[PDB]
Amino acid sequence: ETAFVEVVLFESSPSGDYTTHTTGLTGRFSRAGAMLSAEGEIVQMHPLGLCNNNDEEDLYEYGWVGVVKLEQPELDPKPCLTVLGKAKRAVQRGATAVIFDVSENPEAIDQLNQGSEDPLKRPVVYVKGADAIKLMNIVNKQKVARARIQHL
Amino acid sequence: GSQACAKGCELCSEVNGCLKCSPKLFILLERNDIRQVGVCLPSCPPGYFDARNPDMNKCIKCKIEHCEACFSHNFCTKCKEGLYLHKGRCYPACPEGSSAANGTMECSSP
């Protein structure tokens, strides 16, 4: 269930034309969400960022792409939410898609793909390895980025 | 990312910043650009309030407008001078319905 993720960096000229620069990386569609395409402003979310009362920290314009770097499970012994709970919360808060970095928490994959409940109406994608590192590099370095999730 | 974490932080991440603070301190989520990073603080900055939790101390952004100190993100305890406080919210004039009017500063009746 392969997901192609394009990260778009854009710059405006005085004239008014946009210059873009795009890089590709790959992940997988999870059963937590629909297997649909999605595009939107990248927003990195801290693990605690999708928790109770913190959720209403700020408001984003509808249609953002949540990006979450999961920590090793010992570093999070008391999760406020399950990974599914986090995805659901993000979608409720206007996410058009959610991307999880599961390199430090591969087990999370199983939590995403094995849920008893109705899959979300929006795509939930996970990445790992060089792709996750690439995505995180972009997230860290860049001020603004648009994500395009393609296929299946 | 060539160094250990931050002063009052005991659980750190390059991407996520601070994950867990020292028990007395407060964790605050700072949104800089795309990034959301944990930061450890002795006290909450203006705009945020002192959400006193048994498991983690949080600084939470107040969402009420013309508020200097709020009990929660949408309820307010004290309003900036010189505004009137109706059901948890601040108004330049007591809302339509009954009102304080000295009535020292909180809008009662309903």
Numbering used by the authors:
A (entry chain A): 57 to 208
B (entry chain E): 36 to 145
What's the paper's own text on this?
Zinc RING finger 3 (ZNRF3) and its homolog RING finger 43 (RNF43) are trans-membrane E3 ubiquitin ligases that negatively regulate Wnt signaling. ZNRF3 and RNF43 contain an extracellular N-terminal protease-associated (PA) domain, a single pass trans-membrane helix and an intracellular C-terminal RING domain with E3 ligase activity. RNF43 and its homolog ZNRF3 have been identified as E3 ligases that ubiquitinate Frizzled receptors for degradation, whereas RSPO1 captures ZNRF3 for removal from membrane, thereby increasing Frizzled expression on the cell surface.
We co-crystallized ZNRF3 ectodomain with RSPO1 consisting of the Fu1 and Fu2 domains. The ZNRF3-RSPO1 complex reveals an extensive interface, burying ~1,200 Å2, between the two molecules. The dimeric arrangement observed in the structure of ZNRF3 is conserved in the crystal structure of ZNRF3-RSPO1; the two ZNRF3-RSPO1 dimers contact each other sideways through H-bond interactions made by the β1-β2 flaps of ZNRF3. In two copies of RSPO1 (denoted chains F and H) the Fu2 domains are less well packed and display higher B-factors than the other copies (chains E and G); these two sets differ by ~20° in Fu1-Fu2 domain orientations. Gln71 and Gly73 residues are located on the ZNRF3-RSPO1 interface and the Anonychia-related mutations, Q71R and G73R, would affect binding to ZNRF3 due to steric clashes and electrostatic repulsion. The structures of ZNRF3-RSPO1 and LGR5-RSPO1-RNF43 show that binding of ZNRF3 or RNF43 would disrupt the 2:2 LGR5-RSPO1 complex.
